Design a protein around this ligand. Structure first.
Ligand SMILES: CCCCCCCS[C@@H]1O[C@H](CO)[C@@H](O)[C@H](O)[C@H]1O
Ligand SMILES: CCCCCCCS[C@@H]1O[C@H](CO)[C@@H](O)[C@H](O)[C@H]1O
Ligand SMILES: CCCCCCCS[C@@H]1O[C@H](CO)[C@@H](O)[C@H](O)[C@H]1O
Ligand SMILES: CCCCCCCS[C@@H]1O[C@H](CO)[C@@H](O)[C@H](O)[C@H]1O
Ligand SMILES: CCCCCCCS[C@@H]1O[C@H](CO)[C@@H](O)[C@H](O)[C@H]1O
Ligand SMILES: CCCCCCCS[C@@H]1O[C@H](CO)[C@@H](O)[C@H](O)[C@H]1O
Ligand SMILES: CCCCCCCS[C@@H]1O[C@H](CO)[C@@H](O)[C@H](O)[C@H]1O
Ligand SMILES: CCCCCCCS[C@@H]1O[C@H](CO)[C@@H](O)[C@H](O)[C@H]1O
Ligand SMILES: CCCCCCCS[C@@H]1O[C@H](CO)[C@@H](O)[C@H](O)[C@H]1O
Ligand SMILES: CCCCCCCS[C@@H]1O[C@H](CO)[C@@H](O)[C@H](O)[C@H]1O
Ligand SMILES: CCCCCCCS[C@@H]1O[C@H](CO)[C@@H](O)[C@H](O)[C@H]1O
Ligand SMILES: CCCCCCCS[C@@H]1O[C@H](CO)[C@@H](O)[C@H](O)[C@H]1O
Ligand SMILES: CCCCCCCS[C@@H]1O[C@H](CO)[C@@H](O)[C@H](O)[C@H]1O
Ligand SMILES: CCCCCCCS[C@@H]1O[C@H](CO)[C@@H](O)[C@H](O)[C@H]1O
Ligand SMILES: CCCCCCCS[C@@H]1O[C@H](CO)[C@@H](O)[C@H](O)[C@H]1O
Ligand SMILES: CCCCCCCS[C@@H]1O[C@H](CO)[C@@H](O)[C@H](O)[C@H]1O
Ligand SMILES: CCCCCCCS[C@@H]1O[C@H](CO)[C@@H](O)[C@H](O)[C@H]1O
Ligand SMILES: CCCCCCCS[C@@H]1O[C@H](CO)[C@@H](O)[C@H](O)[C@H]1O
Ligand SMILES: CCCCCCCS[C@@H]1O[C@H](CO)[C@@H](O)[C@H](O)[C@H]1O
Ligand SMILES: [Mn+2]
Ligand code: NA
Ligand code: NA
Ligand code: NA
Ligand code: NA
Ligand code: NA
Ligand code: NA
Ligand code: NA
Ligand code: NA
Ligand code: NA
Ligand code: NA
Lengths: 182, 82, 82, 82, 82, 82, 82, 82, 82, 82
């Protein structure tokens, strides 16, 4: 307890003294940093693809073009979760839909932060899709005549792996542009 | 600074946190995708069975992503706290 | 700060946190899906056995996802605190 | 607010956090499921042995998931704090 | 709301956090389960030694889950702070 | 009111956090159990040396789990702040 | 005590959180370094091709690390909130 | 409250957080235990060289666990802030 | 001027958070070290190339740890917020 | 409570958080240790070169653990904010 007010009432009073927009901006900054945590995923996954690509080229150097092609295509797919988070952060930085709002400061602030929190889901697809890229590169190095079939199955599976990244992006966009709480 | 607004604010956060469940299927299904590609490459003749097994297994891996989404959507559009 | 409101608000948050449990089965069952796809490609004639085993094991892997969902549904629709 | 409403609210938070433990068995048992499916496809005649081992080990992996649920249930329905 | 209420409140949260420890044995024991099932498929005649070794190792891996449980239970029913 | 009970409340929180360390040995020792089981199946006649090596290595992996438990015990029963 | 101070404080913390993104490339590129070292050992005559491929892939894996840094630097040195 | 008591409370929290470092050595040394046990099973008369190498590498892996312990012990028993 | 202390306090927290980036290179470079040691055992004649490749890749995996360090050092010794 | 005490308190938290970096080298060096032990078992006569490679790579893996320690030590014993 802080003096007499419980810590919750203390924190609310503390936050209450500021113009609402400053509070909203502050929580946006947090939302912004949190969104970027998604970048862990493509880093792990694309690095895996890099390793499998290096291994495959070592085994079959005359096929480096096909190996590298699928490594890069698959890695491009893995990048999307990272791009999405970057977009959300950039929106919260430079086109913030909460700051110029009439509604409750608590709701706008929480929503700003919540938008970034949701984007953390992007770790999953980035990691998984990058793993898939590396296996694609590996398989193509072993059997380049199957590169088309390997690419398609890799892309199908990568698409399935994307959905929870999309669900999260959808929740953030709802908080930002179709908020039921306002 | 009504209690109602504080319920709604924490509902936003709860909803956002529910989406972190999505990390799991992303990784797991990625693994499934990579094994599918590896397997189709090795035995193109079995690709129909391989792809069907990968998708079936991937559907199962999806459920806890859906459970998180459902909780988020409940907090957003069918909140029981108000 | 009305006590009822603070209880409800924190219930929303804890409900979201409980769903983080869902990360686990998503990873594990996706691994299961991948191994299943790999085994079917290797031995198509055994795919009935492979899939039954994959599914049985994935079902066991689902339970802690369900436990998380249950706690969230309790907080939402059968809250013992009010 | 009354001291017990605050305790209740955090109890809801503490309950949700307890369920994070469930991430563990989800991953681990999923791995067991994948290895089980792989071994069955390799040697279907030994599937009785493979599956029994898989389940016994998975049963062990379940416990810390149960431990978390118990703490959650204690906070929800048998709370020592009020 | 007394300071004692705040202690109980944070004990409820500390207890939940303690259970996060449970993630580890869940993963590791699941891995042990998978390797055990793999080894059994490869050599069913050796399953008694394989299983005993698996359960011995898993028992060890269980301890830090118990440590977390012990800390939670202390916070819940033998709290040194009140 | 303030001060002493705030330290005790945060100590409860610190103690729980300290147990998160337990995640590590749970994973690592479960991996060791799996490799040990696998090796025993492969070379039953070497199982004594296999188990010995596994347990020695597991013992070492336990330490930071214990360092964590120690810090929690200090916060609970030998707290230097009060 | 100004609202400006609250913005800056949150920006300081948010900049720090953004750098957590850097965990990913550190793991992934370390994996690439390991596979490249292994590949060169097996096939030293392909060393130039193996390394160029490793570095191209590692360059791609770097980007989300750079995105995090850029966001941190914006929050520090070109903050749009003030 | 007195600022000194706020310093002590946060130090308790910081002490617990520092122990999270222990997750790493638990995982890594567990891996080494597993590889050591595997290698001993395969090459019984190389056992001493295997174990020595495993222990040497484990000792190195221990260090960041110790660094965390030291920071926590500083916070607990040799705190510079008061 | 109280607000400047608030900024300073949060910068200290932000600086620590930035160092979490260091988890990544620790894991990745340890993998490279293992693969390098394994490759050297397999083909000792190639060790200078193996190691050179291992270190080159390790240098790349280092960058995001350094980015974290830099954000920490900015918040500590060249802080633009005060 | 003086602003200084708030800075010292937050610095204690920041120092704890900085140590989280240590999770990484613990995992990575433990991996190196296991691969080194495995390589020595396979080829005992190459053990001096294997161990030297292992330790070199491990030393590189240590640095971001050292970076975190340094940030914590700064916050503890050379704190620029007061
Ligand atoms: C995610 C896509 C980023 C675009 C990068 C273009 C790289 S271009 C790339 O260069 C390689 C050098 O080894 C060639 O082997 C390969 O055939 C070529 O596609
Ligand atoms: C990220 C979505 C990728 C969609 C599939 C690629 C179109 S088709 C694909 O084109 C690639 C680049 O031209 C080539 O690697 C390959 O030869 C060709 O089949
Ligand atoms: C490219 C992937 C990310 C997709 C982002 C979807 C939202 S895009 C978003 O749309 C708003 C509509 O009002 C615009 O005001 C805003 O400028 C724009 O950034
Ligand atoms: C919504 C899916 C977007 C990505 C398309 C993936 C590759 S295209 C895809 O390939 C599959 C596997 O060979 C086929 O079964 C399917 O007919 C075809 O549409
Ligand atoms: C998240 C991974 C998704 C990768 C999908 C790449 C192909 S997306 C797109 O899908 C269309 C079907 O609607 C196809 O007709 C078209 O060829 C394809 O480019
Ligand atoms: C998340 C689980 C997704 C479940 C998808 C159900 C069938 S989806 C359907 O399945 C075909 C089977 O070959 C694919 O080739 C095709 O591209 C796809 O559209
Ligand atoms: C991990 C699942 C939950 C813990 C295990 C509870 C067993 S569940 C229970 O088990 C019985 C025999 O044990 C079976 O006869 C029955 O089909 C099944 O429902
Ligand atoms: C962390 C608890 C276990 C610490 C290791 C206990 C000694 S274990 C013992 O130590 C001998 C010393 O010469 C080694 O040579 C031998 O290989 C080993 O078995
Ligand atoms: C590092 C752990 C030190 C433990 C010190 C021995 C017990 S000391 C003593 O133990 C009792 C526990 O219920 C209580 O009277 C009290 O909380 C505690 O200070
Ligand atoms: C945008 C792509 C950045 C990474 C490019 C990967 C191959 S870059 C490659 O690096 C080698 C390192 O020794 C040099 O020998 C070679 O001249 C150079 O082209
Ligand atoms: C790549 C940008 C980050 C590294 C360089 C720091 C930005 S340069 C920056 O510019 C401003 C003066 O014009 C001030 O904020 C500050 O004194 C100065 O460091
Ligand atoms: C590339 C994204 C930005 C990363 C570096 C942070 C901005 S750097 C900073 O930007 C200021 C904006 O007013 C300039 O006035 C100043 O000269 C410049 O140093
Ligand atoms: C906390 C784990 C400490 C490691 C367990 C005791 C081994 S101590 C370790 O042992 C190596 C192998 O004999 C020696 O060569 C080395 O000098 C020594 O540091
Ligand atoms: C790497 C970006 C941050 C670089 C900050 C410039 C250091 S400047 C210098 O730094 C010393 C410690 O390093 C402090 O003791 C001293 O007060 C400070 O002025
Ligand atoms: C690679 C170096 C990047 C350093 C980040 C730009 C900081 S700019 C920085 O502003 C500080 C304000 O105290 C001064 O201490 C310092 O001398 C000045 O250069
Ligand atoms: C959501 C976080 C809310 C945190 C509010 C509690 C910090 S209130 C804190 O009080 C201190 C001494 O009175 C001052 O030094 C400091 O400037 C002020 O922010
Ligand atoms: C402080 C913990 C250090 C962890 C690393 C173990 C020491 S490894 C150490 O480092 C040298 C390179 O710097 C190696 O070449 C050499 O083999 C060895 O003396
Ligand atoms: C923590 C940094 C460790 C040193 C990294 C750069 C060392 S430089 C490196 O040093 C090795 C032995 O010292 C030699 O094997 C190698 O030829 C030399 O290039
Ligand atoms: C990356 C290394 C940065 C430098 C290490 C921390 C220096 S911190 C610096 O140290 C000076 C000498 O001890 C003190 O006089 C001063 O008060 C303190 O701010
Ligand atoms: Mn009362
Ligand atoms: Na999905
Ligand atoms: Na599922
Ligand atoms: Na389960
Ligand atoms: Na267990
Ligand atoms: Na243990
Ligand atoms: Na240890
Ligand atoms: Na990238
Ligand atoms: Na170390
Ligand atoms: Na890097
Ligand atoms: Na390093």
């Amino acid at each position: 307890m802080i003096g007499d007010m419980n810590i919750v009432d203390f924190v609310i009073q503390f936050l209450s003294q500021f113009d609402p927009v400053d509070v909203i901006k502050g929580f946006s900054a947090l939302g912004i940093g949190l969104a970027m945590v998604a970048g862990v995923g493509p880093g792990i996954g694309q690095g895996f693809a890099a390793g499998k690509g290096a291994e495959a080229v070592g085994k079959n150097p005359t096929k480096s073009n096909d190996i590298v092609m699928i490594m890069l295509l698959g890695a491009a797919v893995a990048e999307t979760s990272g791009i999405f988070s970057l977009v959300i952060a950039l929106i919260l930085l430079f086109a913030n839909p909460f700051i110029s709002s009439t509604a409750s400061v608590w709701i706008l602030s929480a929503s700003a932060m919540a938008s970034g929190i949701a984007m953390i889901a992007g770790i999953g697809p980035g990691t998984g899709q990058g793993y898939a890229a590396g296996k694609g590169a590996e398989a193509v190095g072993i059997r380049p005549e199957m590169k088309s079939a390997i690419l398609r199955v890799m892309l199908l599976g990568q698409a399935v792996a994307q959905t929870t990244g999309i669900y999260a992006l959808i929740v953030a966009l709802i908080l930002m542009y179709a908020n039921p709480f306002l | 600074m009504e209690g109602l607004d504080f319920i709604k604010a924490c509902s936003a956060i709860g909803a956002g946190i529910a989406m972190i469940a999505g990390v799991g299927p992303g990784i797991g299904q990625g693994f499934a995708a990579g094994k599918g590609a590896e397997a189709v490459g090795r035995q193109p003749e079995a690709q129909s069975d391989i792809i069907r097994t990968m998708l079936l297994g991937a559907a199962v891996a999806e459920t806890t992503g859906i459970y998180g989404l459902i909780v988020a959507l409940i907090l957003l559009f069918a909140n029981p706290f108000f």
